[PDB]
Amino acid sequence: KRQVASGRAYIHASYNNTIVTITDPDGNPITWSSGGVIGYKGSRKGTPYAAQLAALDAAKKAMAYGMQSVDVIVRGTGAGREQAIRALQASGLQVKSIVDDTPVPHNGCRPKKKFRKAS
Amino acid sequence: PSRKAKVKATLGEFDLRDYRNVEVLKRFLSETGKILPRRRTGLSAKEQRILAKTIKRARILGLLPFTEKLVRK
Amino acid sequence: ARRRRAEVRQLQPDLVYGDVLVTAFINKIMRDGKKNLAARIFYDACKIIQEKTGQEPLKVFKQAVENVKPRMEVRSRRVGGANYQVPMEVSPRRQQSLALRWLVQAANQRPERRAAVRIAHELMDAAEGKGGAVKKKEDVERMAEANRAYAHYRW
RNA sequence: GUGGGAGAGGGUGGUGGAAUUCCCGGAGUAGCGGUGAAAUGCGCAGAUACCGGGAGGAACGCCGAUGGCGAAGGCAGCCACCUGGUCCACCCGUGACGCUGAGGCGCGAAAGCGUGGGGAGCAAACCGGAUUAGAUACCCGGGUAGUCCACGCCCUAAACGAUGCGCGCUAGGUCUCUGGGUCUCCUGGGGGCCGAAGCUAACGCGUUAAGCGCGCCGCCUGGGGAGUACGGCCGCAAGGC
Ligand SMILES: [K+]
Ligand SMILES: [K+]
Ligand SMILES: [K+]
Ligand SMILES: [Mg+2]
Ligand SMILES: [Mg+2]
Ligand SMILES: [Mg+2]
Ligand SMILES: [Mg+2]
Ligand SMILES: [Mg+2]
Ligand SMILES: [Mg+2]
Ligand SMILES: [Mg+2]
Ligand SMILES: [Mg+2]
Ligand SMILES: [Mg+2]
Ligand SMILES: [Mg+2]
Ligand SMILES: [Mg+2]
Ligand SMILES: [Mg+2]
Ligand SMILES: [Mg+2]
Ligand SMILES: [Mg+2]
Ligand SMILES: [Mg+2]
Ligand SMILES: [Mg+2]
Ligand SMILES: [Mg+2]
Ligand SMILES: [Mg+2]
Ligand SMILES: [Mg+2]
Ligand SMILES: [Mg+2]
Ligand SMILES: [Mg+2]
Ligand SMILES: [Mg+2]
Ligand SMILES: [Mg+2]
Ligand SMILES: [Mg+2]
Ligand SMILES: [Mg+2]
Ligand SMILES: [Mg+2]
Ligand SMILES: [Mg+2]
Ligand SMILES: [Mg+2]
Ligand SMILES: [Mg+2]
Ligand SMILES: [Mg+2]
Ligand SMILES: [Mg+2]
Ligand SMILES: [Mg+2]
Ligand SMILES: [Mg+2]
Ligand SMILES: [Mg+2]
Ligand SMILES: [Mg+2]
Ligand SMILES: [Mg+2]
Ligand SMILES: [Mg+2]
Ligand SMILES: [Mg+2]
Ligand SMILES: [Mg+2]
Ligand SMILES: [Mg+2]
Ligand SMILES: [Mg+2]
Ligand SMILES: [Mg+2]
Ligand SMILES: [Mg+2]
Ligand SMILES: [Mg+2]
Ligand SMILES: [Mg+2]
Ligand SMILES: [Mg+2]
Ligand SMILES: [Mg+2]
């Protein structure tokens, strides 16, 4: 119960799960959701439909705090990013700006064998 | 094929070694803080090579960005 | 059908109501190539529709067929070595085919004595929104849309 | 010699931002992670996701390329200092001072060894979870030496253009890097592609020769046994010649 009425929406989309964190304009979170907060347990979380459900659930939780407009921030390349985008877009929440802010290094650390053949 | 406009052709007389001229080096960066390739800038090999180091200097001085964020995705 | 597209067969219209849909339902009723027996069954079922309902049996028939048509089904697909139940829409021809097949099959599951009574009761119950055929439609539209998580495997 | 030029060539010191991890605080709640699917794992001692601050180690995104430099290995943020090679123009100086090179000497990726330090990420060995007929594997969660630094060893490789060095001669076209010039183009040095003559068993090579010649060094003489044995030399050892 804070009545923020305007904040940010971070989307963390990986190939294994999509998780949505709704925060205030300073970044402090309010509510959140993910594929695991919905009934989906295993690989079904890395599904665009699961991402849609997570986005809609986080949006409905933010409705309790009476929030209307959000600023969307996307991080990570994963199946279900655009589906969460389109879920938040038409959810009653006014989407003011969508921004991709995926953290890309300047070739700092050595990846795992899974991500090798690169630097 | 980058048929919109060349940065050099959309510009006049300028110094390629001036790391303090921010408003002219801003044109040579993309929407992100990244340095534009040759197909976008329309510079020569030597020109682009000098531009790279001058942009890096302008970045270290705090004038140009190392990286920006993408909007309207 | 690999080379061609296998154009649909055009059925002859009905001798009574002039509807090709009635003829298709006759054919799904037909057994061992006994057309006259199937026509007897269906037209006696129509005579059962009246004197049990003031509405013409053609309207009840078409409304039941419309109530049985499914909107989405679920087909299997082999992806990544596993087999998934992918939901997808249904073309109108397959809607009609499944509707008539389910109508006949559910009618013959009834405990009624003779065939005309089975078909008539199934048509009436499906028109008013119940029976085994509507149960099949609900089960298919439950399996589909119960696996919404595979909608991106539509193909 | 003079005057210019390009360069991740090398060494030393300093310095910047992104990211990973960890610590502190805020906010916040039931999972995160991971896979074909899972489980170990981590999470109510509050994780993941988000914001801010701090520490540390390592590597430099875009530029960036089929590019550049170096004898090879190899070299990629930025700044300064020290320093090597090289190219062009002038036609100035010396006057055959040249080429090659058995030995010798020095350099020599990675891994490995010694002493000290460092240790974020990764990760042999190893500890587990899966898979499997079994799985001393691939897949997943951890993880030590190591990877990093200083100094000293080690001398190996698909150390590759699988092509020793130098010089001269023998059609061109095209792309490119870098100079000079009467700057459509010409001329010189380097990096590619296609091709004259010619060569090759063929594939292919073809002014960057695998063509035509000359000089000098290295090496080959059927396969296995075998880069093994013995001997010698070198090395702390692994081991190398
Ligand atoms: K090269
Ligand atoms: K130690
Ligand atoms: K020129
Ligand atoms: Mg998952
Ligand atoms: Mg049935
Ligand atoms: Mg250098
Ligand atoms: Mg905390
Ligand atoms: Mg973990
Ligand atoms: Mg752990
Ligand atoms: Mg536990
Ligand atoms: Mg508690
Ligand atoms: Mg974390
Ligand atoms: Mg932080
Ligand atoms: Mg530490
Ligand atoms: Mg690149
Ligand atoms: Mg070179
Ligand atoms: Mg090499
Ligand atoms: Mg003279
Ligand atoms: Mg003289
Ligand atoms: Mg020599
Ligand atoms: Mg020698
Ligand atoms: Mg060595
Ligand atoms: Mg080493
Ligand atoms: Mg050591
Ligand atoms: Mg040590
Ligand atoms: Mg690890
Ligand atoms: Mg591992
Ligand atoms: Mg194991
Ligand atoms: Mg087996
Ligand atoms: Mg077993
Ligand atoms: Mg540790
Ligand atoms: Mg040791
Ligand atoms: Mg090679
Ligand atoms: Mg060789
Ligand atoms: Mg050979
Ligand atoms: Mg040669
Ligand atoms: Mg040339
Ligand atoms: Mg050729
Ligand atoms: Mg010929
Ligand atoms: Mg030929
Ligand atoms: Mg030659
Ligand atoms: Mg032999
Ligand atoms: Mg022999
Ligand atoms: Mg042998
Ligand atoms: Mg050996
Ligand atoms: Mg040996
Ligand atoms: Mg011996
Ligand atoms: Mg000894
Ligand atoms: Mg050994
Ligand atoms: Mg051994």
XYZ file of C-alpha atoms (C1' of nucleotides) and ligand atoms in Angstrom:
638
model
C 0.000 0.000 0.000
C 2.047 2.921 -1.331
C 0.034 4.173 -4.346
C 3.006 4.662 -6.653
C 0.874 5.195 -9.801
C 3.973 5.254 -12.044
C 7.130 3.164 -12.159
C 9.474 0.910 -14.107
C 9.154 -2.669 -15.363
C 12.263 -4.847 -15.731
C 12.073 -8.027 -17.822
C 14.790 -10.666 -17.355
C 14.364 -13.109 -20.248
C 16.690 -16.112 -20.419
C 16.374 -19.318 -22.415
C 15.288 -21.077 -19.193
C 12.922 -18.576 -17.541
C 11.389 -15.110 -17.852
C 10.980 -13.025 -14.693
C 9.280 -9.622 -14.390
C 10.095 -7.128 -11.625
C 7.951 -3.999 -11.289
C 9.664 -1.150 -9.422
C 9.180 2.529 -8.612
C 10.866 5.276 -10.692
C 13.918 4.852 -8.417
C 14.203 1.107 -9.074
C 13.007 -0.179 -5.695
C 10.716 -3.147 -6.450
C 7.076 -3.359 -5.403
C 5.849 -6.703 -6.740
C 7.216 -9.277 -9.167
C 6.474 -12.616 -10.822
C 8.060 -15.320 -12.977
C 7.310 -18.646 -14.614
C 7.717 -20.302 -11.227
C 5.202 -18.059 -9.477
C 2.695 -19.428 -11.990
C 2.117 -23.180 -11.795
C 4.819 -23.885 -14.390
C 7.743 -25.761 -12.848
C 10.237 -27.214 -15.327
C 11.216 -26.090 -18.820
C 7.684 -24.725 -19.339
C 8.949 -21.477 -17.775
C 11.118 -20.736 -20.823
C 7.873 -20.473 -22.860
C 6.534 -17.205 -24.315
C 3.102 -18.096 -22.905
C 4.656 -18.515 -19.455
C 6.298 -15.107 -19.884
C 2.911 -13.644 -20.825
C 1.334 -15.108 -17.689
C 4.188 -13.778 -15.539
C 3.900 -10.291 -17.038
C 0.123 -10.215 -16.586
C 0.392 -11.467 -12.997
C 3.008 -8.859 -12.084
C 0.863 -6.188 -13.749
C -2.233 -7.241 -11.795
C -0.166 -7.188 -8.596
C 0.961 -3.653 -9.446
C -2.711 -2.750 -9.952
C -3.180 -3.315 -6.212
C -0.667 -0.504 -5.664
C -2.733 1.594 -8.089
C -0.069 1.955 -10.781
C -1.089 3.096 -14.264
C 1.986 3.989 -16.356
C 5.253 2.037 -16.558
C 8.643 2.274 -18.253
C 9.688 -1.115 -19.616
C 13.306 -2.299 -19.478
C 14.359 -5.490 -21.291
C 17.438 -7.513 -20.330
C 18.576 -10.740 -21.936
C 17.910 -12.661 -25.146
C 15.356 -15.383 -24.484
C 12.227 -16.830 -26.029
C 9.328 -14.931 -24.479
C 10.753 -11.409 -24.260
C 8.465 -9.965 -26.939
C 5.522 -11.942 -25.564
C 6.002 -10.342 -22.141
C 6.327 -6.973 -23.898
C 3.009 -7.469 -25.701
C 1.426 -8.765 -22.484
C 2.354 -5.612 -20.567
C 1.460 -3.363 -23.514
C -2.254 -4.247 -23.430
C -2.832 -4.978 -19.746
C -4.353 -1.711 -18.549
C -0.820 -0.556 -17.754
C 0.209 2.290 -20.042
C 3.631 1.430 -21.477
C 5.551 4.690 -21.891
C 8.902 3.494 -23.260
C 10.529 0.138 -24.015
C 14.308 0.044 -23.551
C 16.745 -2.831 -24.068
C 19.541 -2.637 -21.474
C 21.134 -6.070 -21.755
C 24.497 -6.097 -19.922
C 27.145 -6.853 -22.555
C 30.768 -7.044 -21.347
C 33.768 -5.478 -23.065
C 35.469 -8.901 -23.158
C 36.178 -9.033 -19.440
C 35.548 -12.547 -18.123
C 35.954 -16.044 -19.539
C 32.626 -17.793 -20.249
C 31.760 -21.369 -19.441
C 32.408 -24.100 -22.009
C 28.754 -23.671 -23.014
C 29.412 -20.128 -24.289
C 32.961 -20.597 -25.617
C 34.319 -20.181 -29.160
C 34.042 -16.476 -28.306
C 35.395 -13.964 -25.799
C 23.389 -1.215 -47.643
C 23.201 2.031 -45.616
C 21.730 4.266 -48.321
C 20.410 6.906 -45.901
C 23.391 9.285 -45.700
C 27.140 9.239 -45.134
C 28.439 11.034 -42.051
C 31.335 12.557 -44.004
C 29.131 13.692 -46.904
C 26.647 15.138 -44.386
C 29.487 17.211 -42.890
C 31.890 19.972 -43.851
C 35.473 20.874 -42.953
C 36.551 19.460 -39.596
C 39.586 18.153 -37.728
C 39.749 14.379 -37.318
C 42.347 14.614 -34.528
C 40.406 17.018 -32.257
C 39.240 14.888 -29.324
C 37.510 17.864 -27.662
C 35.012 18.607 -30.469
C 32.097 16.651 -29.020
C 29.232 17.830 -31.232
C 30.995 16.539 -34.354
C 32.040 13.173 -32.886
C 28.494 12.539 -31.647
C 27.536 12.190 -35.323
C 30.030 9.316 -35.701
C 28.446 7.205 -32.950
C 25.373 5.033 -33.407
C 22.203 5.255 -31.325
C 24.312 3.378 -28.781
C 27.728 4.650 -27.721
C 29.307 2.321 -30.271
C 31.596 3.596 -33.023
C 29.974 3.479 -36.449
C 31.559 1.211 -39.092
C 33.042 2.347 -42.402
C 29.803 1.839 -44.353
C 28.050 4.417 -42.143
C 30.800 7.026 -41.725
C 32.109 6.977 -45.292
C 35.681 7.568 -44.127
C 38.887 6.081 -45.492
C 41.033 3.498 -43.711
C 43.442 6.095 -42.308
C 40.606 8.516 -41.502
C 38.616 5.868 -39.614
C 41.762 4.706 -37.811
C 42.437 8.232 -36.529
C 38.758 8.741 -35.670
C 38.732 5.606 -33.507
C 41.541 6.787 -31.226
C 40.172 10.332 -31.032
C 36.762 8.943 -30.024
C 38.413 6.766 -27.371
C 40.178 9.855 -26.005
C 36.896 11.795 -25.955
C 35.324 8.877 -24.072
C 38.076 8.791 -21.442
C 37.721 12.552 -20.971
C 34.023 12.047 -20.172
C 32.740 13.753 -23.331
C 31.520 10.769 -25.370
C 29.754 7.704 -23.948
C 31.215 4.228 -23.721
C 27.764 2.687 -24.206
C 24.174 3.932 -24.338
C 20.749 2.286 -24.187
C 18.394 1.426 -27.039
C 14.935 3.009 -27.125
C 11.654 2.172 -28.877
C 12.341 -1.551 -29.237
C -1.796 -35.939 -51.343
C 1.808 -35.030 -52.155
C 1.718 -33.631 -55.697
C -1.815 -32.210 -55.861
C -4.063 -30.523 -53.276
C -6.828 -33.196 -53.258
C -9.899 -31.114 -54.068
C -12.935 -31.939 -51.948
C -15.644 -34.260 -53.243
C -18.932 -32.567 -54.123
C -21.861 -34.568 -52.754
C -25.308 -34.801 -54.293
C -28.004 -32.757 -52.511
C -30.644 -34.416 -50.375
C -33.765 -35.889 -51.963
C -35.947 -34.364 -49.201
C -34.382 -31.174 -47.801
C -31.947 -30.540 -50.661
C -28.982 -30.187 -48.291
C -25.619 -31.788 -49.033
C -24.888 -31.783 -45.289
C -27.784 -34.205 -44.785
C -26.247 -36.425 -47.473
C -22.867 -36.361 -45.718
C -24.564 -37.341 -42.456
C -26.332 -40.169 -44.315
C -22.959 -41.353 -45.605
C -21.483 -41.306 -42.102
C -24.529 -43.340 -41.040
C -24.137 -45.708 -44.009
C -22.705 -49.137 -43.209
C -21.331 -51.723 -45.665
C -22.680 -49.594 -48.509
C -26.334 -49.786 -47.408
C -27.559 -46.364 -48.529
C -31.282 -47.134 -48.359
C -31.015 -48.411 -44.784
C -29.150 -45.253 -43.748
C -31.813 -43.094 -45.403
C -34.539 -45.056 -43.603
C -32.716 -44.522 -40.298
C -32.227 -40.786 -40.791
C -35.699 -39.978 -42.119
C -37.374 -41.998 -39.370
C -35.182 -40.056 -36.944
C -36.497 -36.859 -38.545
C -40.067 -38.086 -38.074
C -39.067 -38.649 -34.439
C -37.759 -35.058 -34.224
C -41.261 -33.820 -34.949
C -44.007 -34.933 -32.524
C -41.203 -34.498 -29.991
C -40.277 -30.947 -31.073
C -42.406 -28.495 -33.027
C -39.295 -27.315 -34.873
C -38.445 -28.696 -38.292
C -35.809 -31.459 -38.027
C -33.553 -29.645 -40.509
C -33.078 -26.684 -38.153
C -32.445 -28.954 -35.155
C -29.978 -30.968 -37.252
C -28.015 -27.928 -38.429
C -27.966 -26.376 -34.952
C -26.658 -29.623 -33.450
C -23.959 -29.835 -36.131
C -22.988 -26.241 -35.331
C -22.890 -27.041 -31.603
C -20.553 -30.005 -32.190
C -18.034 -28.182 -34.433
C -14.775 -27.643 -32.493
C -12.803 -24.427 -32.799
C -9.331 -25.651 -31.775
C -7.843 -29.143 -31.688
C -4.503 -30.601 -30.618
C -2.141 -32.503 -32.924
C 1.044 -34.321 -31.955
C 4.462 -33.021 -32.969
C 7.963 -34.468 -32.568
C 10.304 -31.703 -31.368
C 13.739 -32.127 -29.803
C 13.199 -35.880 -29.622
C 10.060 -35.585 -27.477
C 6.398 -35.650 -28.500
C 4.157 -32.703 -27.629
C 0.414 -32.056 -27.832
C 0.423 -28.815 -29.831
C -2.831 -26.824 -30.041
C -3.942 -25.368 -33.359
C -7.072 -24.157 -35.123
C -9.371 -26.363 -37.211
C -10.241 -25.827 -40.863
C -14.018 -25.689 -41.482
C -14.029 -28.932 -43.490
C -12.389 -30.823 -40.629
C -14.837 -29.146 -38.243
C -17.744 -30.552 -40.267
C -16.153 -33.994 -40.656
C -15.401 -34.343 -36.943
C -18.860 -33.006 -36.070
C -20.692 -35.590 -38.178
C -18.398 -38.448 -37.137
C -18.835 -37.578 -33.458
C -22.601 -37.255 -33.893
C -22.922 -40.753 -35.370
C -20.424 -42.338 -32.964
C -22.053 -40.814 -29.877
C -25.513 -41.730 -31.178
C -24.537 -45.396 -31.402
C -23.269 -45.204 -27.799
C -26.808 -44.466 -26.586
C -28.881 -47.190 -24.879
C -31.818 -46.666 -27.265
C -33.215 -49.775 -28.932
C -33.339 -48.954 -32.651
C -31.033 -46.732 -34.667
C -33.508 -44.009 -35.637
C -34.269 -43.345 -31.963
C -30.548 -43.171 -31.154
C -29.859 -40.674 -33.941
C -32.938 -38.586 -33.112
C -32.134 -38.395 -29.395
C -28.487 -37.580 -30.102
C -29.477 -34.837 -32.547
C -31.924 -33.315 -30.059
C -29.503 -33.453 -27.119
C -26.671 -32.016 -29.225
C -28.934 -29.238 -30.503
C -29.891 -28.233 -26.969
C -26.224 -28.441 -25.965
C -25.512 -31.818 -24.334
C -24.806 -35.446 -25.201
C -21.672 -37.401 -25.975
C -20.767 -35.340 -29.042
C -20.711 -32.074 -27.096
C -18.674 -33.913 -24.453
C -16.176 -34.805 -27.191
C -16.070 -31.188 -28.382
C -15.435 -29.995 -24.824
C -12.730 -32.625 -24.305
C -10.940 -31.602 -27.508
C -11.203 -27.882 -26.710
C -9.903 -28.760 -23.228
C -6.878 -30.742 -24.422
C -6.225 -27.933 -26.855
C -5.890 -24.694 -24.863
C -4.898 -26.928 -21.969
C -1.475 -27.014 -23.658
C -1.349 -23.303 -24.512
C 2.364 -23.406 -23.614
C 2.978 -25.116 -26.986
C 1.150 -22.551 -29.147
C 4.456 -21.492 -30.729
C 4.779 -25.016 -32.196
C 1.809 -24.254 -34.462
C 3.522 -24.795 -37.856
C 73.257 11.036 -45.458
C 69.083 14.416 -45.791
C 63.773 15.054 -45.570
C 59.282 12.722 -44.900
C 55.623 8.264 -43.772
C 52.582 4.128 -41.747
C 52.253 0.455 -37.932
C 48.173 -4.492 -31.993
C 56.712 -4.267 -33.321
C 58.994 -4.489 -28.114
C 59.985 -2.841 -22.857
C 58.559 0.341 -18.294
C 55.223 3.285 -15.550
C 50.489 5.298 -15.102
C 45.301 5.325 -16.239
C 39.568 4.362 -18.148
C 34.828 2.107 -18.716
C 31.561 -2.280 -19.434
C 30.871 -6.993 -17.206
C 31.472 -11.472 -13.563
C 32.092 -12.490 -8.380
C 31.992 -10.955 -3.359
C 30.733 -7.451 0.786
C 27.320 -3.269 2.833
C 22.541 -0.830 2.554
C 17.711 -0.086 0.558
C 13.475 -2.179 -1.425
C 10.938 -6.829 -2.056
C 8.771 -12.560 -1.818
C 8.692 -18.125 -2.969
C 11.638 -19.742 -5.722
C 15.998 -19.512 -8.513
C 18.977 -22.328 -11.413
C 19.585 -25.901 -14.950
C 18.196 -29.677 -19.065
C 15.980 -33.475 -24.393
C 13.563 -34.127 -19.702
C 15.434 -33.875 -15.043
C 18.117 -34.193 -10.401
C 22.348 -32.658 -7.335
C 22.786 -27.396 -5.975
C 21.396 -22.757 -3.783
C 16.854 -20.207 -1.135
C 12.597 -18.440 5.480
C 19.882 -17.368 8.485
C 15.234 -13.803 2.803
C 17.961 -16.244 -2.510
C 16.861 -15.043 -7.816
C 15.072 -10.200 -10.118
C 15.808 -4.268 -8.939
C 18.453 0.323 -7.094
C 22.736 2.512 -4.708
C 27.801 2.170 -2.506
C 32.408 -0.430 -1.859
C 36.503 -4.269 -2.825
C 39.223 -7.295 -5.980
C 41.200 -9.976 -10.045
C 41.303 -10.682 -15.025
C 40.236 -9.469 -20.203
C 39.770 -4.981 -23.541
C 33.079 -4.516 -26.633
C 32.070 -1.112 -30.972
C 36.298 0.502 -34.101
C 37.787 -4.570 -36.524
C 38.438 -6.092 -41.899
C 39.127 -10.965 -46.716
C 43.237 -5.101 -42.459
C 48.288 -3.767 -40.002
C 53.263 -5.048 -37.519
C 57.177 -8.725 -36.545
C 62.602 -13.147 -38.163
C 59.552 -16.708 -36.008
C 56.742 -17.529 -31.695
C 53.358 -13.869 -31.693
C 51.176 -8.596 -30.947
C 44.280 -5.438 -29.837
C 41.286 0.105 -24.134
C 44.017 4.762 -23.310
C 48.301 8.058 -22.011
C 53.529 9.048 -21.396
C 58.595 7.581 -21.612
C 62.440 4.383 -23.579
C 63.372 1.450 -28.096
C 63.731 -2.021 -32.705
C 62.529 -2.820 -37.717
C 60.710 -0.842 -42.215
C 59.048 2.186 -46.633
C 59.320 6.437 -49.856
C 61.535 10.941 -52.147
C 66.383 13.659 -53.310
C 70.841 11.159 -56.464
C 74.157 13.763 -51.767
C 78.334 10.435 -49.526
C 81.533 5.272 -49.117
C 83.376 2.357 -53.472
C 82.075 -4.781 -53.980
C 82.442 -3.271 -48.023
C 78.303 -8.884 -51.136
C 75.080 -13.881 -50.599
C 74.614 -18.085 -47.716
C 75.914 -20.298 -43.422
C 78.253 -26.614 -40.508
C 79.360 -25.208 -35.225
C 78.487 -21.431 -31.456
C 75.250 -17.942 -29.313
C 70.359 -15.852 -28.501
C 64.847 -15.663 -28.981
C 61.081 -19.367 -28.832
C 52.543 -20.404 -28.190
C 50.538 -23.567 -24.809
C 51.281 -27.000 -21.088
C 54.813 -28.153 -17.320
C 58.861 -27.209 -12.955
C 61.244 -23.997 -8.718
C 60.877 -19.669 -5.109
C 57.704 -15.834 -3.688
C 53.009 -13.400 -4.425
C 48.086 -13.253 -6.258
C 43.526 -15.669 -6.914
C 37.397 -12.439 -9.853
C 35.989 -15.624 -13.925
C 37.298 -20.227 -15.953
C 38.925 -25.009 -14.825
C 42.892 -31.003 -15.459
C 42.460 -34.034 -10.998
C 38.648 -34.762 -7.786
C 33.380 -34.491 -5.113
C 28.408 -35.063 -6.628
C 23.650 -35.122 -10.036
C 22.001 -37.287 -14.512
C 22.251 -40.371 -18.862
C 23.364 -45.396 -20.019
C 23.139 -52.286 -20.799
C 27.622 -50.048 -17.990
C 29.218 -44.108 -18.631
C 36.176 -44.092 -15.036
C 32.510 -39.760 -21.068
C 29.690 -36.256 -23.700
C 25.043 -33.047 -20.347
C 24.269 -30.526 -15.237
C 25.930 -28.527 -9.869
C 30.604 -27.787 -7.339
C 35.988 -27.647 -7.417
C 42.342 -27.882 -6.652
C 46.811 -27.312 -9.260
C 46.737 -24.078 -13.090
C 45.305 -19.839 -15.760
C 47.666 -14.025 -13.504
C 52.474 -11.309 -11.621
C 58.115 -11.073 -10.518
C 62.536 -13.845 -11.093
C 64.772 -18.428 -12.771
C 64.054 -23.116 -15.613
C 61.895 -26.026 -19.483
C 63.064 -26.039 -26.117
C 58.044 -29.037 -27.501
C 53.807 -28.170 -31.797
C 49.248 -29.257 -37.479
C 56.498 -23.811 -34.347
C 51.773 -24.407 -41.219
C 52.255 -21.080 -46.779
C 52.806 -28.856 -44.224
C 56.522 -24.224 -49.517
C 64.906 -22.410 -46.292
C 67.490 -17.679 -47.607
C 69.229 -14.207 -51.499
C 69.494 -12.249 -56.537
C 68.174 -11.941 -61.636
C 64.728 -13.043 -65.704
C 59.496 -14.219 -67.737
C 51.737 -11.455 -70.289
C 48.193 -9.051 -67.861
C 43.412 -7.948 -65.099
C 41.105 -6.853 -60.450
C 40.604 -5.762 -54.945
C 43.291 -3.601 -50.973
C 47.144 -1.289 -47.286
C 51.080 2.528 -47.474
C 54.039 6.399 -49.664
C 55.648 9.695 -53.955
C 54.145 12.248 -58.419
C 52.556 15.864 -64.167
C 47.003 12.893 -58.328
C 41.556 10.358 -65.110
C 46.384 7.905 -63.855
C 51.689 6.872 -63.308
C 55.531 4.972 -60.146
C 57.549 2.207 -55.550
C 56.900 -1.171 -51.209
C 53.396 -4.885 -48.896
C 48.641 -7.919 -48.423
C 44.623 -11.093 -51.668
C 41.849 -13.070 -55.899
C 41.688 -14.596 -61.435
C 44.811 -15.862 -65.029
C 49.979 -15.587 -70.435
C 54.005 -18.677 -71.242
C 55.733 -22.475 -68.566
C 55.678 -26.271 -64.525
C 53.113 -30.369 -61.957
C 51.339 -37.416 -61.131
C 47.143 -34.643 -60.504
C 44.991 -31.048 -57.186
C 46.991 -26.880 -58.281
C 51.405 -22.968 -58.815
C 51.684 -18.918 -61.957
C 56.275 -11.087 -60.855
C 54.235 -12.961 -53.050
C 56.446 -19.270 -58.532
C 55.514 -24.716 -56.998
C 58.086 -21.028 -64.034
C 63.337 -20.054 -66.064
C 68.369 -19.720 -63.868
C 72.637 -19.151 -60.217
C 74.896 -19.507 -55.049
C 74.843 -21.533 -50.031
C 72.632 -24.320 -45.954
C 69.042 -28.175 -44.068
C 66.776 -32.767 -44.995
C 64.687 -37.650 -47.768
C 66.164 -43.150 -49.647
C 59.736 -48.811 -48.674
C 56.091 -49.860 -44.103
C 55.884 -51.844 -39.036
C 59.462 -52.294 -35.056
C 60.320 -46.672 -33.491
C 61.226 -41.309 -32.365
C 61.584 -47.016 -29.137
C 66.687 -49.248 -27.173
C 71.763 -48.234 -26.025
C 75.465 -44.321 -25.619
C 76.338 -39.098 -25.131
C 74.910 -34.028 -24.109
C 71.356 -30.898 -21.715
C 67.386 -30.550 -17.610
C 65.648 -29.805 -10.424
C 61.995 -32.956 -12.467
C 58.666 -33.946 -16.419
C 61.772 -34.809 -20.206
C 64.336 -32.825 -24.714
C 68.282 -33.143 -28.806
K 46.799 -10.897 -41.712
K 49.671 -22.776 -3.733
K 48.045 9.991 -53.315
Mg 13.746 -23.281 -16.708
Mg -16.880 -40.241 -29.225
Mg 52.745 -1.331 -29.834
Mg 21.079 -8.255 0.735
Mg 23.637 -22.503 -7.854
Mg 27.238 -22.736 -4.687
Mg 17.457 -27.404 0.670
Mg 10.052 -16.760 8.404
Mg 23.504 -12.439 -7.840
Mg 25.780 -3.385 -7.638
Mg 39.757 -10.745 -2.644
Mg 35.636 -8.061 -34.766
Mg 54.390 -8.181 -42.679
Mg 49.906 -18.228 -36.405
Mg 76.268 9.583 -56.924
Mg 84.433 8.623 -55.889
Mg 71.830 -13.654 -42.895
Mg 72.583 -21.722 -36.603
Mg 58.716 -21.946 -24.586
Mg 53.280 -20.994 -19.654
Mg 54.067 -21.951 -11.088
Mg 52.431 -20.750 -6.213
Mg 32.953 -23.366 -12.566
Mg 32.160 -28.585 -14.886
Mg 30.161 -37.747 -12.884
Mg 23.885 -47.725 -24.806
Mg 19.764 -47.091 -13.474
Mg 36.252 -20.244 -4.627
Mg 52.252 -27.860 -7.689
Mg 48.370 -22.698 -41.155
Mg 57.626 -24.416 -42.394
Mg 55.390 -34.708 -46.175
Mg 58.509 -18.396 -51.374
Mg 52.324 -5.854 -55.473
Mg 45.124 -19.126 -59.763
Mg 48.887 -23.624 -70.180
Mg 43.207 -27.901 -64.602
Mg 61.213 -17.050 -57.029
Mg 61.524 -46.469 -40.919
Mg 62.925 -51.498 -42.704
Mg 57.805 -44.311 -36.984
Mg 58.788 -37.439 -28.237
Mg 61.807 -39.272 -25.855
Mg 69.623 -42.664 -23.040
Mg 71.536 -34.734 -14.301
Mg 54.517 -38.110 -16.859
Mg 54.138 -39.505 -18.591
